[PDB]
Amino acid sequence: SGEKRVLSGRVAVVTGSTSGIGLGIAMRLAMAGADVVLNGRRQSPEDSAIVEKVAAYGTRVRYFAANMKDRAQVEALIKFTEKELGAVEILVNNAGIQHVSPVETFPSDKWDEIIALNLTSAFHATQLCLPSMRQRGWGRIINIASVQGLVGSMNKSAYCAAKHGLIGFTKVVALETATTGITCNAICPGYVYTPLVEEQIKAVAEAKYGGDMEAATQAFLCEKQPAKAFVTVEQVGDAAVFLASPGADMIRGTTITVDGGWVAQ
Amino acid sequence: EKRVLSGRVAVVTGSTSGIGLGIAMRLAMAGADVVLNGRRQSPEDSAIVEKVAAYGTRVRYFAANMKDRAQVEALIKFTEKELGAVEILVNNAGIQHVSPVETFPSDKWDEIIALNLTSAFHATQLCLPSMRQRGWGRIINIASVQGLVGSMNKSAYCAAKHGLIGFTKVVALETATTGITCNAICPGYVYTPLVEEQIKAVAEAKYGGDMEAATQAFLCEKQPAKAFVTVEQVGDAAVFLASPGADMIRGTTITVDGGWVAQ
Amino acid sequence: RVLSGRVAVVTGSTSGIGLGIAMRLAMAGADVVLNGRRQSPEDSAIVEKVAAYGTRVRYFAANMKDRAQVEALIKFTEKELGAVEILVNNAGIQHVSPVETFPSDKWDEIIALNLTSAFHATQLCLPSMRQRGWGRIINIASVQGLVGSMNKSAYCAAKHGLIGFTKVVALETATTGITCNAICPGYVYTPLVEEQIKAVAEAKYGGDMEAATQAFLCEKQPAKAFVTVEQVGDAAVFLASPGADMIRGTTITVDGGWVAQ
Amino acid sequence: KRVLSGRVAVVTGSTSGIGLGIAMRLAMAGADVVLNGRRQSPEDSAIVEKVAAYGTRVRYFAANMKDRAQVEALIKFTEKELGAVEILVNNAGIQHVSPVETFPSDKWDEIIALNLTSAFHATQLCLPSMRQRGWGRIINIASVQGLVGSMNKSAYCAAKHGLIGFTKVVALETATTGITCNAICPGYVYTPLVEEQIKAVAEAKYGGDMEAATQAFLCEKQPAKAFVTVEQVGDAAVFLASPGADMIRGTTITVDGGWVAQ
C-alpha cells in the first residue's frame, strides 16, 4: 500500500452515489483515503462496476441499495455500514430529485416527494448517525444543497423550498454540535452536467430550440451561471473533501457555494 | 372612511390568537374584509369575530385544519362564497416543537413541515389562478428569523421556515410581471402562547419557576432590543406589504426582530 | 398623519429618489429640509412642490463629501426647524467602469459620498436623538449592497459597506427609541440610471433610448418594470412610523425580484 | 509535487497573525511567497525562515498598503524577484473599537483605506497580468463582520462588508476566465488584533482577569466557544487557490465556529 492520506481510516456514507454529484463525491473521498459506502434507490446491473471504479483508489468500498424516503431503509443503510466497515464518521446527504413546474399546477405528490427526499431524509440520516459521532467525539455531516437553497428560480418551488430548508437544518445541527468535534455544513453547487440537469436541457431543447441540444445547453447555462460553464462533479467532491478535512474543524453551519458566480449577482 | 385596503378580501390562517389575530386586526383597521380561521370551532369564536369587526369591515370565521388540503380548499371556497375572491392570502398558522435533533420525534418533524411549509404551498396554489385572472394579489407568508438563521433545538422549525422563504422567492419570480406579489415577514420573538410555553419550560429547567428572570434571559439570548415584537407590529408589516407602495416589493423578507439577524 | 411635527433631513433630495422620499415624508406630516450639492435655479420650485402638503420645508445647499458642510446642514436644520429626528442618507453617485481602469479619484468619491458621508451625518445626529429618546436613521442603499454587478465595483463596495454600517448603528441603539435601517431599491428611473441607459443606447442600440431602457431593465429586474420614487418614499414612511419601532438593522428591498433570484 | 507548486503568491500583512498563517499554508502547498508588513522590523528574517521551512522561494517587502505607490512597488518587486503575481491575498487590516458617536474621523478613514481600498488598488494592479496569463486567484480576507454587524465596530464592519461587495464584482467581471475572486470570512482568531481587544475588555470590565475576559469575548459571538486558528484560515486559502476551486467565484468561505449560522 501507499502513504496514508488525509481521510485515511474514516468511514463515509454518500447517499445517491451511483450517479452524478454523489458518485463524484464518493470518488473524491476515496481518493482522499476514506472508506466509502455507495447507495442507490434500487439495485441495478451497473452497481458492481461503480463499486470497482471507486475501489480503484485502494480503500474499502461497499454498496447498499436503499430508498432514502423510507426511514427503515435509511436505518438499514446505517446499520449495514456499521456491520461491514464500522461507525459512520462522514455522512454525505446527497440523494435528490427535481421536478420543473409552475406553482399553480405543481403536482401534490411530486411536492411531497421532493420535500421527503431532498429535506426530510437528511434529517432521518443525521438523527441516526449523530449518537455514534457524539460518543466518538468526531463527525462530519455534509449536506448537498444547491444555489436553489439560497435564491429562487422559476418553476422549482418544491426544490427551492426543500433546499432552503436543508440549509436551515444544517445551521441547527451545526449549532447543537458547535462545542464538539462534529461539524455540519452544506455545499451549494450551481449547474453540474448530470442526468438531473440533462433532462431539463432536453425539455428546453424540444420546447424552444427545435431539438438542438447545443444551443439549448448554452442558453440554459448562460441564463443563470456567469461563468458560462458547468461546475463538475469533481469540484463538488473536492469541496466535500475540504469540509471533511482537519482544516475545516471550525467551519460550522455554513454554505460552500460552488456555482460559477450564480449567487454573487 | 377611505382606507388603503378598503374592500380587499383577506384570509389569515390561524388567526384566532397570537400573531394571526394581530394581523387580522391590522388588516381590518386598514379597511380589509377578513376571514378568520382556526383549527376547530371554539366557544370564543364569536367574540374574536366581534373584536375584529370593531374596525368596521366584513368579518367571517371558518374552522379548517390547514394540514388537510381539502379543508384549505374549503376555506378558500367559503371565502369566495361569502365575500368574493381571495385577494390577500396570509399564510400564518404554525406550530413549534423544541427538541435536540437526536430525539426529535418523527411525527413532530412531519407535522411542522406539513403546517409551517406545505400548507402555505397548498393555499397559494389554490389562490393564484383567481389572482392572475383579477390582475392583483398579495401572498404574505409568516416566516421567522428562524427562516434566515438557525437556533439550537429547533431543527424542524428552522427547516420549515427557511423553506417557506425559498417558496416565497419562487412564487414572486413566477408572478413578477403581474399585479401579484409574494413576500415573507420574519418576526423575532413575540409574546404569544407559542413563546410563553417555551419560557415556562426554561423557567422550570433553569430558574426554579421564576418567569420574570426566565423571560428576560429568553429574550436577551437572541433579541438585542431586549423587548418583544408585538402582534400589532407584525400586522403593520402585513398592511405595508398589501399596500400600493409595495407593488414592486417581490420575493423578499420584511424582518421585524429587534436586531436579531443584524448580529 | 403619522409623522406630523417630526423634523426630517433628506440628503440629495433635489431630484430622483431623494425628492420622492421628501415628498412622501411631507405627505405623512413631517417638516423637511431638502439638500443638493449646489444651488440650482429650480430650488424654489422644488421647495414649493414639497411644501404643497402644509408642513415646513427648507432648502440648504451642502456638499455631503465635506464634513464641515454636513455639520452646517445639521446646524441649519436645528436653527430653522429644530432637532433632527429623521435622517435619510440618500445623496449618491455612480460611475461605471471595469475594475482595471476604474479611476482612483472616482473610487474615492463614491466611497466618500455613498458610505462615509452617511457615517458623518449619523455621528452628528445621534446625540440629540439619544437625548430625546427617539430617532430614525434611514440609509438609501441599493440591491448593489446585497449582490454584485459588473463594472460597479466602487458602488457595490460602498453600498455593501453602508448596509454593514446600518447594522452596527442599529445594534448600538437597539434598546433605545432610535432605529437604523436601509432601503435597497432596484432600478428607479432617475438621472443616475438615465445616464447609464444613454451610454448603452449609443454603444449598442443606435441611440434608441426606449429599446435600450428595456434591455437595461430586463438584464437585472424580473418585474420588467421600474421601481418608482413614490414607492421608495412609502418604504421610508413605513420605517419612520410606529409600526417599525422594532425593525432594526435590516434591509427593506424594493427591487422587482432582483435579489430573490 | 504539491498543489500550488510553481505559483507566485503575495500576501499583504503576512508578518503577523492570519497573514503569516496564510503564507505558511500556501508555502506548504508549494507556492513561492512574498511577505509584507507595514514597515521593517527586527523579526523579518525569522519570519522569512518560518515560511521558507517548506522548500519554496520566499521574499519580503516592506510597504504601506495605504499608499498606492507602495502597493505598486510591492507588485513590481515580486515581478522582478519571483515572477508574475498569480495569487494575491489581500489580508493587511486594522481594527479600532469605538461607539459611532465618538468614532474618530481619521480612524474611520484609515480603516476604509486599508481594509477596503487597498484591496482595490492591489487587485487593479494585478489583474492585467492574470488576464494575459489566463489564470489568477484574488483572495480577500474579510470577516464575519462583513456579513453581520457588531457593536462599536462601525468602520470595520463597513469596510469588511464593502470588501465582500468588491469581491463579488471582481468575480463577475472575470467569470469567463481562469481568474477567480473570493473572500474568506474568519470569526475570532487569537492574533494581536484580537489580543489587544481582549486586554482592553479585561482591564475595563474583568479586573484584569484575562481568562474571564477571553471566555466572555468568545462566548458572546462564537458558538464553538473556541478560537479559529491561523492555520485553518490558511487551509481555506489553499482550498480557494487549488484547482478544485476553479468554479468557486464571488463567494465567501466562512470559518467562524458558527457565528453567522445563528
Ligand SMILES: NC(=O)C1=CN([C@@H]2O[C@H](COP(=O)(O)OP(=O)(O)OC[C@H]3O[C@@H](n4cnc5c(N)ncnc54)[C@H](O)[C@@H]3O)[C@@H](O)[C@H]2O)C=CC1
Ligand atoms: N446537477 C446539478 O446541477 C445540481 C444538483 N444538485 C444536487 O445534487 C444532488 C445529486 O444530484 P445529481 O447528481 O445532479 O442527480 P442524479 O440524478 O445524477 O443522481 C441522483 C442520485 O440519487 C439517487 N436517488 C434518487 N432517488 C433516490 C432515493 N429515493 N433513494 C436513494 N437514492 C436516490 C439516484 O439513484 C442517483 O444515484 C441532488 O441533491 C441535487 O439536488 C445540487 C445543485 C446542482
Ligand SMILES: NC(=O)C1=CN([C@@H]2O[C@H](COP(=O)(O)OP(=O)(O)OC[C@H]3O[C@@H](n4cnc5c(N)ncnc54)[C@H](O)[C@@H]3O)[C@@H](O)[C@H]2O)C=CC1
Ligand atoms: N411567536 C413568535 O415569537 C413568533 C411566531 N412566528 C410565527 O407566527 C405564526 C403564528 O404564531 P403564534 O401566533 O406565535 O402562535 P399561536 O400558537 O399563538 O397561534 C397559532 C394559531 O394557529 C392556529 N393553528 C394551529 N394549528 C393549526 C392548523 N392545523 N390549522 C389552522 N390553524 C391552526 C391556532 O389555532 C392559532 O390560531 C407561526 O407561523 C409562527 O411560526 C414567527 C416568528 C416569531
Ligand SMILES: NC(=O)C1=CN([C@@H]2O[C@H](COP(=O)(O)OP(=O)(O)OC[C@H]3O[C@@H](n4cnc5c(N)ncnc54)[C@H](O)[C@@H]3O)[C@@H](O)[C@H]2O)C=CC1
Ligand atoms: N436610481 C436607481 O436605480 C437607484 C438609486 N439608488 C440610490 O438612490 C440615491 C439617489 O439616487 P438617484 O435618485 O437615483 O440619483 P439622482 O442623481 O437623481 O439624485 C442624486 C441626488 O444627490 C445629490 N447629490 C449628489 N452629490 C451630492 C453631494 N456631493 N452632496 C450633496 N448632494 C449630492 C444630487 O444633487 C441629487 O439631488 C443614491 O444613493 C443612489 O445610489 C439606489 C438604488 C437604485
Ligand SMILES: NC(=O)C1=CN([C@@H]2O[C@H](COP(=O)(O)OP(=O)(O)OC[C@H]3O[C@@H](n4cnc5c(N)ncnc54)[C@H](O)[C@@H]3O)[C@@H](O)[C@H]2O)C=CC1
Ligand atoms: N483576528 C481575527 O479575529 C480576525 C481578523 N480578520 C482579518 O484578518 C486580517 C489580518 O488580521 P490579524 O492577523 O488578525 O491582525 P495582525 O495585527 O495580527 O496582523 C496585521 C498585519 O497587517 C500588517 N499591516 C497593518 N497595517 C498595514 C499597512 N498599512 N500596510 C501593510 N501592512 C499592514 C501588519 O504589519 C501585520 O502583518 C485583517 O484583515 C483582519 O481584519 C478577520 C477576521 C477575524
